[PDB]
Structures are given as structure tokens and as C-alpha cells.
Amino acid sequence: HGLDDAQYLQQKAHNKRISEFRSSSNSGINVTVVLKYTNGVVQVYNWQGTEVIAGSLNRQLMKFPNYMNPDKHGRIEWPGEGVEHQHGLIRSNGGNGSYDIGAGDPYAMQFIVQGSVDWNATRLRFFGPDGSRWMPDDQGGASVRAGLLNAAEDIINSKMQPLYFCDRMAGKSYYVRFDDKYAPRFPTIGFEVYRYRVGATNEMGGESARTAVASLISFPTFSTAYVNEKVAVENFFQPRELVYQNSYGYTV
Amino acid sequence: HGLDDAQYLQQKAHNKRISEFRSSSNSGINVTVVLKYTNGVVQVYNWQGTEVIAGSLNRQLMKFPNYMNPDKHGRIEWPGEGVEHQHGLIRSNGGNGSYDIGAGDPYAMQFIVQGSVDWNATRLRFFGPDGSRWMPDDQGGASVRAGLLNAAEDIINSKMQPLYFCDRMAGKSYYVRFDDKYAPRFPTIGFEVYRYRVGATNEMGGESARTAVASLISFPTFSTAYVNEKVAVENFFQPRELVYQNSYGYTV
Amino acid sequence: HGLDDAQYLQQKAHNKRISEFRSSSNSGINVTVVLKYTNGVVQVYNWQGTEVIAGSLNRQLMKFPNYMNPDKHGRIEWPGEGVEHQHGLIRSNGGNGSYDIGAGDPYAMQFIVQGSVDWNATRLRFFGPDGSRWMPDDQGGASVRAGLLNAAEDIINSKMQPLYFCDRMAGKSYYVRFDDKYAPRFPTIGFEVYRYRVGATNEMGGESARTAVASLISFPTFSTAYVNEKVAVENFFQPRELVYQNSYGYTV
């Protein structure tokens, strides 16, 4: 020895760089919403950002198919799951002529956050299909006069499960069923995710204001629907090195 | 007496809390755009936020049906109201083969703002179908070189009508016809609405910068189209406790 | 002489006002993305703003037709260019049953920025069809762990061509082919464009924070598709006084 210590060190320096770079304010943080349907389809929305990642999905995007991801025949609605159906979700007995639950009404979601993130600061907000603020403990959806838009329960960090990649925690995942218990049966969502900062300077304001504001919407949002989770994982999540928890509880 | 003063006080404390909570920076402010069509349909877009509410609608969303709200048959365009029609709106005599005015070209809008709002600061901006800045006094739509994006007339507060809920003013509404007089015949819109602050600390910046920026897009936008105003009011506005001025000038 | 010096001066004052107004923080800055298709179609997206203009397009909007601009028959997808096709773009050999290259997959884009702009500060970011960060020098699309979201090469100013209107430079244009050389063959994009400031006060923060943040999304985005560049120029760009470089290298 040591014949190849230089090659070894270079590989180590490469591994260190790539792993620690996640801490840079100029690396990416990822937020993925994965919607699950009773036919096995998963619909994926993936947002990226540097300092802040914020977004929402209304019922038009929570359902499948939709204008973003039509079905194989190019349809953005299914018979009996169109406007009349949506009206029956907005208001109890306010519908006409539709399936009671849509094949395209998701039954659960996985919310995955990855990167060097201020985990404690993550907000995930649930609303009813009409935009009413939904709260836990079965009080129903709140009106606009009574609705607290920033509730204690939006802070989901403690319920998120750590997802590891090699020896580091790469992200966290929250799995929830849409059953009117821990989330609405027909929810819409908003979320905010924030960069973990390694110093005290506020990079969302001051000399950083211009780029902070621009960064909110200057990264494309990826979306598609996959026939099943198996295909989604091999063709999207794995190659992007995005951690994901599968239907069996395993990190993949 | 007084046998039930405690129950009375508790109800009073409940009523006070819910009514005054609108003043909290963490309550919701609502902006609703209601588009009216000559077949009686109303198309609703409802934005919510805490400190700032901002948004826009281009012609693709000003018209009905569209990708957000297809018609009962799942169509996002009507024959003779498709691309050729849109081209004829963008530029005078720039179309081919389309209805002169679309059944799905709205004839009026109600712009409703509700919550504890800095009313004086509200902006509503009108643009032509091509994105040209539209100004009052019939000068036409302005080019990009001449277009003032923040005009005196964007400040619509004085033209808005107060809408009361019980003994308090809950919101304000502005009704306008799309007739090239007080608004374009084929408009597109942008708006900004701002929280009324009860103190001097700037919650859009400084220590509040990160959440201020995130809040711009972290609440889902509700949208649907209803067969008529009557149905919209009973199934959406009333239950959400959103004030709304009906076709007869009444607050409902 | 001079019989009409007053009329002359007034016209000169008018010309000076309109030309210099571009420098006002309350004038408009324009960003236009023009996508080019092998059937001659051009698809236009035009954003406006005062201090900052930021945005993105994912594959659903990079392609033609789409939910924003259906084809003449109202279709938002073409056979063999639907979900299966998109899957084959997201991941090599991850598709089934689709055209190898879509008629609706653009082959090039012109990115045009106009107004009083901090030219040096412009960012244009390229990503693959899966949202992977794309870098020059053929290293492929980067994973999320390794992806630098703000790279040196995002600063495209030096590659942009100046476009003049009369005696002033009105904007700059960047033309690029989607050929895996200087941009991805199947790209998605994000961009940030910033106001040139004539003073040192930061109008993206401080006392300007509230309007700065609101301005990010309070101007409608114009979009349409035109049968060819000739028609687009005469019916949209020319009347808006938006500079544009045609297929022959001429400013029009």
C-alpha cells in the first residue's frame, strides 16, 4: 500500500461533495404529492425550489383523469365523475346523476419532502372540496369567518416518517387515508416547505428578496400518472434519486 | 334572574371571538371572481390567503367551458368558440369561421372581496384579450411600451359596494359589465388584495418574509361553474358564509 | 419659421415620455416564450410584470396541443402523443405504443425579454422531461441530490441578441434548438427576469415587500398558438409593439 489512495480520496471527496451539497441554498428541495386511486393508478406532482416550496391542488387536480393528466384516451373527465359529481362533493346532496364515489377520487396520498429542509416548519393544510378549512376532531369544514388558515395541526413534522438514503436521512414521508378521520374524504391541499439554513442571515428577504420571490415559481412542476406504483418507482422516483415509501412501508 | 347569565356570556364570548378573529393575520381573506354568461351560467373562482391575495385570469379561464370547468359533456371548448374565435378576439378581423360573440364569452363579472382587508389598497386590473393594458376613457388597449401597469383606476375601492353580515361590513363587491365602456368587452384580469393590519410591523417582510412569500400560493383556488346564480348561492356561497350580491342588488 | 415649434415640441415630449417610461418601476417588462413545431405552428406564452417576472413550463405546456391551447378540433392531445408517449420521454424505453418524436414536441424556442431589464441578471433554466436539472457538456440530467438549481449557465445574457426599436434597444432574444446539444431534446423550463433599477432602494423588499410579492402573479399570462410565425407576428407581436426575431434573423 497505498497504491491507489489518491483514487480513493478523490472518490471520497466526490461522495462528500454530492452528499453535503444538499445543504447549499442553491441545491434543490423537492416536495412530491402522490395520489392513490382504487384502480392502482398513482398520480404524481413534484415541485422543486431553493429556499421555499409552496403550492396547492384543487379538486380538478386531486382527481384523475384531469386537464394535466388525461387518461389513455385523452379524456379529462370520466362519465359520472364530471361536473354533476363535483357538485355533489362540494355540497351534501347538491349533485345530480353521478357515481357516489369516483373511480377517480383518490383514497389516500403520500406527501414526501426531500432535501436539507427546516423539517419543523413544514405546513400541510387540508380543505374540503369546496375550499372550506378542514380541521381534525370532526367539527366539519369551517366557514371563512371562523376558519383559522394556520392551525397547530398544519405542522405535520412529528407524524412524518424519516426516509434514509445510505447513511443520511434524505427526506420524510407522510401517508394519509382520505376517510374523514385524519383527512377529508374529498380533500384539497396547500403546503409550505422551507430550506434549512446553516446561518442566521435571512435569505428570504433583505439583499435576497428579489431571488427569493422569483424562486417561488421559477421551477417547473412535474406531473404524470402511472398505471401503478411499481412502474412509477422504477421510471420516475428511482432514477431521480427521490426517496419514496412503497405500499409495504419500505423506503425505495 | 339571572339563572343563565353564564350560558349567555359564553355565547357572547363565542360570537365576539368568531367576529373579531377576522382581524387576525392568521384568519382568511377571500377574493371571488364571479363570471356571468348569457345562458345564466355563473363561473366562480375563489382565492384565499392570509396577508396577500393576488391572481389573474386569462381568456382561457374567463370563458366557459374551459380546462378547469368543462361542460356537462366534458368539453373544454364549444364549436365556433375555439381557437379561430379566440384569434378574432385577440385581433380585430384576425379570426376565421366563428360566432361573433361566444355563448361562453362572459358579459359581466362580480368581484367580491371579504375579510379584514386594507380596502383602499385593492387593485383590479383590466387587460384586453391579447394582454394589452386596458384603460378607461376609450383610448383602446395600450402597447407594452406605453402601458402603465399600475394606474390610478386600478384602485377600485370607492366603486365597491359594502356587503354587510349582521352588524358588521363583511366584504365589498364590484359589479361590472363587459361592454367596452367601464371594462373591455373581452377582458382578462389581474388583482391584488391586502390584509388590513392592526399594527405597524410589516408582516410581508423582515422576520415574516418566508411565510409571506409562501402564503401567495399555498392555498388552493376553488373553482366551478353553476347552472345559475340561485344554485351557486345556496350550494357554495351561503354555506361558506361568503357574502355575495345577487342579480337584484341584494346581499345574500 | 418657426410657425409650428409648439406642435413639434409637444410631439417630441410625447415621444420622450413614451420611450423613457419603460424605465419606470410601474411600466411593464415582458417575457415571451415562443415554441416552434415542425408543422410551422408557433405556440406563444407571454408574461408581464413590474419588478420581477418569473415562471415555468412543464411538458404539458411545452407540447402542442394542450389544455391551454387545444387544436382546431378542441383536442388537447394527439393520438400517439398522449400519456404513453410522455412516459417514453420521461424515461428511456419507458414508453409504449407512441410516435418516436411527436409532431407536437417542439424543435426550438425563442426566449424574448423586453423592457428596462437588469439584463445581466436574467436566468433561463433547462430541465429534462422528468424535471431533472439539465446541464451543458452532455453529462445528462442531474438527480435531485446532485442538481445545482442556480448554475453559471442559467445566466444567458451574453448569448442573447439585442433587438432594437427605432434608436433604442427594446429587448433581447435567445434562439435555441432542442437537440440535446445546447438544450435538451425534450425540455422543460424555468426563468427569472428582473427590473433594471435606476436607484439603490430595493423595491423587492422593505416598504415595497407587499406589492413586490403580489406583482409576481397579478398579471395575466397570454397564450395562444398560431398556424405560422407570419400570422403570429402580424396579429399579436406587431400590434403589442413586442419585438420578435423572425426565422430569417430579422427583428420585426
Residue numbers in the entry:
A (entry chain A), B (entry chain A), C (entry chain A): 2 to 253
What does the paper say about this structure?
Cypoviruses, members of the family Reoviridae, subfamily Spinareovirus, possess a single capsid layer with turrets and are commonly embedded in crystalline occlusion bodies called polyhedra, which are formed in the cell cytoplasm and mainly composed of a single virus-encoded protein, polyhedrin. The fold of all the polyhedrins is highly similar – a β-barrel core sitting on a base domain, surrounded by a common array of five helices (H1–H5). The strongest intermolecular interactions define a trimer composed of a cluster of three β-barrels sandwiched by helices top and bottom.
There is no obvious significance to this change. The full length polyhedrin structures are generally well ordered, as expected for a crystal lattice which has extensive interactions and low solvent content (19–25%), however some types show regions of flexibility: 13 residues (136–148) of CPV5 and 6 residues (68–73) of CPV14 have high (>40 compared with an overall Wilson B-factor of 21.3) B-factors, whilst 13 residues (66–78) of CPV15 could not be modelled. CPV4 has limited numbers of molecular interactions in this area, while in CPV5 a few strong trimer-trimer interactions are present.
